[PDB]
Design a protein around this ligand. Structure first.
Ligand SMILES: NCCNC(=O)N1CCN(C(=O)c2ccco2)CC1
Length: 121
């Protein structure tokens, strides 16, 4: 599996699966500050799944590592903002993070393998 470009459709399919998960609904769009007035006091760099999908479709990721860094930021923002490790929305973040890590592992491995094959000689 040495296709250097295959990660992009694989990440599109994984984002589609994430958009079918009920657990993703809080993380699809930005935080309304009328509902969470302190959000930008606590969080430096907002990220949501619609921003990741748009960045991908714009051709503004060079690698699946860059996409993975932005998805992990969604989850670290939730852990940072949560007032409790027993919150509803933080709990949804942890399930969705486990699902995402289970599926992104092969996408990263296959891409890095393809890049090593490209430089083999
Ligand atoms: N359409 C919803 C847009 N997003 C949104 O309102 N939130 C998701 C991100 N947040 C959290 O990760 C979090 C952790 C504990 C409580 O909230 C704040 C709320």
């Amino acid at each position: 599996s040495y296709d250097i470009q295959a990660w992009k459709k694989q990440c599109e399919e994984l984002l589609n699966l994430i958009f079918q998960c009920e657990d993703s609904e809080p993380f699809r769009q930005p935080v309304d500050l009328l509902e969470y007035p302190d959000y930008r006091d606590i969080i430096d760099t907002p990220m949501d799944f619609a921003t990741v999908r748009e960045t991908l479709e714009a051709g503004n990721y060079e690698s699946p590592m860059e996409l993975c860094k932005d998805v992990r930021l969604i989850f670290s923002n939730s852990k940072a903002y949560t007032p409790s490790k027993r919150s509803r929305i933080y709990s949804m973040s942890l399930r969705l993070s486990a699902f995402f890590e289970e599926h992104i592992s092969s996408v990263l491995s296959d891409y890095k393998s393809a890049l090593r094959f490209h430089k083999r000689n």
